[PDB]
């Protein structure tokens, strides 16, 4: 499957792509404002994620730091990033279908659109000003808006018993972005696409 990753933000982002225990394609790349990066994701990939990282510094070996979404200090991510991270999530070729979603379960840093470039399904978007409106206790100093689990580490926010309800914090994310997951047991906003669809992830689709 092909993913085109487009940075429409006025600022540089460092895109990342991983399935948690391995990079997808190169795993990461700098995207200046307007740049597009095309990657190839193996069919059958389960639990892949794409996200943006902000305010990164990397040396020549590809080692450094980002203020959001850092994946163990690497330019080319092999593992998932540090919250807060708006997440494009996908599982491909699962019994003939692709499944895609956007999630705020790990917080929000950059607005995102996640759409097929092939026919058969619709895209999803979270493009509200979540950082600007972020509740005081969820604000991340390095930028972004943390989820409540990351901040408070309770069974209720993290849903660690498999039983939890919505919270004042999850409802904030859900109000601003109804089409993204706001907590673990949120009513699913997953979109079903034909197996082997292709996609575009656009950072700052509006702004």
Author numbering: 1 to 207
Question: What did the authors write?
Answer:
Using lysozyme (1 × 1 × 1 μm) and thaumatin (2 × 2 × 4 μm) crystals dispersed in a cellulose matrix, we were able to collect 100,000–150,000 images in approximately 60–80 min at a wavelength of 1.24 Å. At a flow rate of 0.43 and 0.47 μl min−1, a total sample volume of about 30–40 μl was used with a crystal number density of 5.8 × 108 crystals ml−1 for lysozyme, and 4.3 × 108 crystals ml−1 for thaumatin. We indexed and integrated 30,000–40,000 images for both the lysozyme (space group P43212) and thaumatin (space group P41212) crystals. The lysozyme and thaumatin crystals yielded data sets at 1.8-Å and 1.55-Å resolution with a completeness of 100% and a CC1/2 of 0.992 and 0.988, respectively. In this study, 16% (w/v) and 22% (w/v) cellulose matrices were used for the small sized lysozyme (1 × 1 × 1 μm) and thaumatin (2 × 2 × 4 μm) crystals, respectively. The cellulose matrix with randomly oriented crystals was extruded through an injector nozzle with an inner diameter (i.d.) of 50 μm.
